[PDB]
């Protein structure tokens, strides 16, 4: 029941602020240490801080030194990273972990922190039409931030998916489809309806594929 | 401050090979070099600490050693779990370091992507864009070249590509590249083409249609 | 129990983690 749950991820301005939080179970955290790794999309881990809670003793990266604060609270087994002064290059998924010294043996599955100026977008939805097995989808179209999930007939759907990953267009706005494949003995019987969901925005949209 | 120089970038190995990832470091780091598993979207887990010794539930395939700076971890046998990136750590003193990670992917046999083209939506055209999809669907290995014409143009800076990560079933790869451009200059053209290259195929497949039929 | 613990300490409770 070893737990690390990260929270208070989000998207946040340049310059701004935010609190990140790291609820630990199944283990005091004054036993161990409590590391803080980030990943940029597409990219390697970087470690950012680490602190001995039973000590108070603290490490920082040199690139968020001064910026950025990590510290914690053993009567609430919890861990936090103050971050300041917020930069583009900070976008990332930030992972907690425990471990002795800087091994780091077990990690929480992170919070994405994105810091842009730009504001949330909800996508718009459009059907990928077919035209013996068919394909057909939807663009999930210019949305920000990410991420948004796709599934198809409410997830009874499963079988020949592919959600592609999200690529930034020149707008600064996210885009994707996600398409399937199936035999063409069903496009007229059967329905196929992809399921989308931006909670940054609070978008909720199911759009009908017809050929 | 410890570097972590870690070879290579990725590879490509079939099930049952032995597959060798190296991490070098830039100054003693004695025995103090962790090594971590991560899968597309998940927390990576630790599976070798000091160089050679096996973290819990890490099956027998996996193995470290050490040789001075080097350090190297070794699966016997790849097997389809195994597919995911790599990354050494020293935990020797701060700053902390992590080398660039290795991607595994697993080895298979040529296969040719079935192609499919998808005109704008209606609705689309309605808001003022116009995207146009090339689908290359269950295809094998990832290289693969993708070029749009209109009215038989090779058209150049105006698609984006996108590809799945390997299958868990199949081990192939998808790619969809998606051309979009403002309404008025999608009707400004009639035929929209994707000519796809792939080792699986003969010749190059073209999916093209007529902007209004 | 801090962030300085030696590479053996360091060994020592991954493998008494290891163990149990
Ligand atoms: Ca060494
Ligand atoms: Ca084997
Ligand atoms: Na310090
Ligand atoms: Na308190
Ligand atoms: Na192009
Ligand atoms: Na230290």
């Known amino acids: 029941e070893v737990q690390l749950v990260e929270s208070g991820g989000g998207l946040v301005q340049p310059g701004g602020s935010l609190r990140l939080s790291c609820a630990a179970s199944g283990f005091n955290i004054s036993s161990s240490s409590i590391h803080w790794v980030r990943q940029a999309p597409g990219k390697g881990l970087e470690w950012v801080a680490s602190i001995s809670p039973y000590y108070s003793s603290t490490s920082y990266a040199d690139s968020v030194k001064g910026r950025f604060t990590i510290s914690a609270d053993t009567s609430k087994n919890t861990a936090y990273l103050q971050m300041n002064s917020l930069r583009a290059e900070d976008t990332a998924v930030y992972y907690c972990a425990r471990g002795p010294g800087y091994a780091m043996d077990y990690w929480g599955q992170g919070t994405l922190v994105t810091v842009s100026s730009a504001s949330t977008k909800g996508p718009s939805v459009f059907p990928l039409a077919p035209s013996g097995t068919a394909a057909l989808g939807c663009l999930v179209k210019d949305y920000f931030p990410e991420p948004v999930t796709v599934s198809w007939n409410s997830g009874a759907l499963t079988s020949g998916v592919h959600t592609f990953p999200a690529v930034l267009q020149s707008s600064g706005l996210y885009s994707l489809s996600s398409v399937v494949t199936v035999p063409s003995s069903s496009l007229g019987t059967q329905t196929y309806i992809c399921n989308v969901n931006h909670k940054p925005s609070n978008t909720k949209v199911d759009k009908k594929v017809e050929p | ?213 | 129990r801090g962030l300085d613990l030696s590479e053996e300490e360091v060994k020592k409770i991954l493998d008494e983690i290891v163990k149990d």
């Open chain 2, 1 to 213: 401050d410890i570097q972590m120089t870690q070879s290579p970038s990725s590879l490509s190995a079939s099930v049952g090979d032995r597959v060798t990832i190296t991490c070098r470091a830039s100054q003693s780091v004695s025995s103090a070099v962790a090594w971590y598993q991560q899968k597309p979207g998940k927390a990576p887990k630790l599976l070798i600490y000091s160089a050679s010794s096996l973290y819990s539930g890490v099956p027998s395939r996996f193995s470290g050693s050490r040789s001075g700076t080097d350090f190297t971890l070794t699966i016997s046998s790849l097997q389809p779990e195994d597919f995911a990136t790599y990354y050494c750590q020293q935990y020797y003193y701060a700053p902390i370091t992590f080398g660039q990670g290795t991607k595994v992917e697993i080895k298979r046999t040529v296969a040719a992507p079935s192609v499919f083209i998808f005109p704008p939506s209606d609705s689309q055209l309605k808001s003022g864009t116009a995207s146009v999809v090339c689908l290359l669907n269950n295809f094998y290995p990832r290289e693969a070249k993708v070029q749009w014409k209109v009215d038989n143009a090779l058209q150049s800076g105006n698609s984006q590509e996108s590809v799945t990560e390997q299958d868990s079933k199949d081990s192939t790869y998808s790619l969809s590249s998606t051309l979009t451009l403002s309404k008025a200059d999608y009707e400004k053209h009639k035929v929209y083409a994707c000519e796809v290259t792939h080792q699986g195929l003969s010749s190059p497949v073209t999916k093209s249609f007529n902007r209004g039929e």
